[PDB]
Assembly symmetry: C4
Homo-oligomer: 270 residues x 4
């Protein structure tokens, strides 16, 4: 379909200066899958927000603090979000990393969507469903298996026509779809669509998607244009893996290290 | 008002040699806001004290130890301080980071103020109130929103005349006021007033104020002149952010890293 | 016996490219010996797997997360494995590091062996026993004392004829035996046998065997040939200690650092 | 008294090669003072032992594991040692860092002294007492205030004649005394006495003594001559502070960093 790449030149032209930067909400991490909250939290705080509130399970909080003492907490927030509309205003919200694929998580999604801000759905928050007309984009970040869960398009078919399917479903759902893989597709509901040119096989390991979700969350808080936030996050996330492989084997990357590398990588694009 | 900058030359002339160094008390961190205690604790121990006692909530202690095993503890100290005068002597005391804005915290402030040492109030310990005549300076570290809470001066007005307001209120309250922002103002109750020339937008993220409070606390323990301690802490805290941005994006700094950078930055001024 | 060395040339010829990478199961760590799970987990995730599930004791989970937030968990998995066959499919399984030498651990071994994948037994999972005919190699990683436990060959005798004993018992048991020591022996049940040429005395400290077990586990997930996975893991584990001693005393290595060094060492062999 | 310095030439001549290395027991860390166990544990494992068992309070264990996953544990060991003789054999034992100054700690000291190995007493294990004739040296590591507690020699008097007092009391008690300060004195019960030439004011902060105790413990496990172990530990501990101050301010060192620096410093003396 000749989908263009979001190139270095586009990144440089669109990344913000740091001369407020928003407050983000991260609804992530469960007793059974705690690490996703730390990964997404580090990605978000590394990515230019002003404040982060992590609504994680109570028993997950103590696992984050020593690594990310800059985050604050909404105790059992992802569970509380199932029961009522948020009362605080956030610049952007992410939900899903480390959450189970349950109806209660979808109830929290429904409540989060009544806020007027960009919302990211990932992992356990991804389901076959439709989305309400609202202010603010909804950004879905499926791996191909999650895309199958969302759409019924089998993975072996999806992978032959990734951009065509991503574009079709972004239009049908009226959501942004970041369809992960080699050459991640970023499809917008208005029909714009891009391929990401960065990254390598070092990213094909658990946790790298949690880091990406956090990076998007933070970038939404420092870019005025949420489209550029999404594109720049996907781009820089892959550029971190590429920097890693200059001196380290691609087999050996741990996701949290992408966050650790981002400071230097981002500097290069300023 | 032509407020002078506290310059490199002033810093070099006033930083102490390490040829006792005091015991500090840090009353910080609550179950709901734990990270502030780790941030302020690292800042304090990095800043030239001899010993640190952290009076944090019992459930916060285990979150600090693996990162800062050099600190010792007064279990639930900030809560116990509400009920009685301190029995141990400290070289300096800080109260507030990660504490709620409650009457019980003000009761602890009242008790801490009966000690004969410099005392720093930050975050939850900042309120609209007056201060008793005592030995030792009281040092307030408000962001503009906290200054509004203290004084009723709205933020949009404050920000047009920052040094004039800081100076006026330092005189009226007879406290030191470190009014944070770009060009942080350091106003003394005797009418001396300075602007800080260091820092950048990397500091505009949660946790950097907790780190600063700790840095002031530690510097009070190694400088004979508490005025120089405050000025040097504010200066070096900003100089750490500047060093960071040489090779890292200003969007990507985490507060704890200021503490990690301070060793090298301080060396340059010796 | 003229056993050949698995040399650099063999390593280079056999290490995989990262152009799925498997899901591994690690059954390790107990309340009394928790650290082995973190060591083996880091080794495994550093070594090219796609996903890691750690079946550790419930109280050990929170000790791993802040260091390795990329792992997921099967709560009390090593204990649950005593009662039933695994229902999920894994590319490879390791059992033993930090587990007690008990009958219940052997019950878990028996159940794990009904899976169709390579299985590694280490530490508490090593016992005097025989092994069922199955699909997938069984890989034993004894120190000489554990070899004595397995075979009744006293250590002072073993150490005079290490490769002869390792070869004899690999044949008799029909298992791979990685007999650790200076010049670790890798003996296969088909009679192939190699010596490892890398390593030094820095490895003669607690925890380095836990790291090795993890490294083998991960390498089994990215090599098509499990024999090459075992050989390359033993080789690279020793090569990490050698890199360490270039600028650091051999007395001072901590096992987890082998995992930290592996990224750079592996790169050199690509 | 013309006490000689233990110089670089002596260190080089006496440090061991790493071509067993012993199992050490560390009885340290209490709920109220947990960090000392992590500091002493890191120092010990960094210092050439083969295995470390940490007998700390149950609630302190989880605080050590993520930082030092190579250690194993004797749960509530320092408390259990009050009730009975040790049943396991250790190459060396340390007791005291982070322990209260109580009779129960002295009961544990009494029991530990029935073992046939070098024993180090520090911090809460230091008291006014005498010592039984035994195999293995007893090594006391007092700061001047602890020396006052041990002997009744006031600090202001002690500090005028440090080596004379240390020598006199080492002879009277028949213990090694490492009397800390600038120019730490190492006095042996046979009348040998040395001054340490390394170190600086960076060491005058909480936790550095816990690190030293651990370093001595580990060095006792890799030196055949326990006198050289003590001397080399004190020397290298100070040499780590000196390396630190080359690029970092002496005000800013954290004790755990001495352990982190030791690998490189030790290499220089090989
Ligand atoms: O998430 P999930 O797909 O619902 O369930 P899983 O537990 O299988 O996957 C968890 C993580 O491991 C990754 N993953 C799972 N199996 C994998 C495989 N063997 N190879 C590479 N990555 C794998 C997933 O991409 C996911 O990473 P992310 O959460 O950071 O996006
Ligand atoms: O503290 P507080 O002002 O009482 O309450 P908040 O939870 O909103 O602020 C917590 C921290 O986030 C910072 N902060 C809050 N919102 C922010 C915004 N969106 N942009 C930049 N920084 C912000 C505050 O400065 C504070 O940092 P500090 O505690 O280290 O001084
Ligand atoms: O394991 P184990 O042999 O059953 O029991 P131990 O507690 O004595 O050994 C635990 C670890 O310390 C190591 N070890 C024990 N004593 C040792 C000694 N004093 N010197 C060197 N290493 C030693 C073992 O090799 C083992 O390391 P690994 O688990 O990473 O393979
Ligand atoms: O130990 P202690 O002397 O019984 O009691 P304290 O709590 O006062 O001291 C704890 C630590 O802080 C250190 N310390 C206490 N006050 C100090 C001071 N203000 N300046 C420098 N160091 C100090 C002690 O040397 C000790 O360090 P170490 O445990 O690593 O040897």
């Amino acid at each position: 379909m000749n989908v263009p790449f979001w190139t270095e030149e586009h990144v440089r032209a669109t990344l913000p200066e740091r001369d407020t930067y928003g407050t983000a909400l991260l609804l992530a991490g469960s007793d059974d899958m705690p690490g996703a909250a730390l990964l997404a939290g580090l990605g978000a705080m590394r990515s230019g927000l002003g404040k982060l509130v992590i609504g994680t399970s109570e028993n997950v909080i103590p696992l984050i603090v020593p690594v990310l003492p800059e985050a604050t907490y909404w105790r059992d927030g992802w569970k509380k979000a199932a029961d009522a509309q948020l009362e605080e205003t956030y610049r952007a919200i992410a939900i899903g990393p480390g959450l189970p694929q349950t109806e209660s998580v979808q109830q929290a999604v429904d409540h989060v969507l009544t806020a007027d801000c960009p919302v990211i759905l990932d992992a356990g928050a991804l389901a076959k469903r439709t989305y309400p007309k609202r202010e603010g984009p909804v950004i879905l970040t499926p791996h191909p298996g999650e895309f199958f869960r969302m759409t019924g398009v089998p993975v072996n078919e999806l992978q032959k026509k990734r951009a065509e399917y991503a574009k079709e479903w972004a239009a049908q759902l009226q959501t942004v779809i970041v369809l992960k893989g080699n050459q991640t597709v970023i499809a917008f509901p208005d029909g714009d669509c891009w391929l990401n040119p960065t990254g390598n096989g070092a990213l094909a390991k658990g946790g790298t998607g949690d880091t990406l979700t956090g990076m998007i969350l933070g970038m939404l808080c420092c870019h005025e244009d949420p489209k550029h936030a999404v594109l720049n996050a996907v781009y820089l996330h892959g550029a971190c893996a590429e920097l890693w492989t200059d001196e380290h084997s691609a087999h050996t990357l741990l996701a949290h290290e992408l966050s650790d590398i981002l400071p230097r990588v981002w500097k290069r694009f300023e």
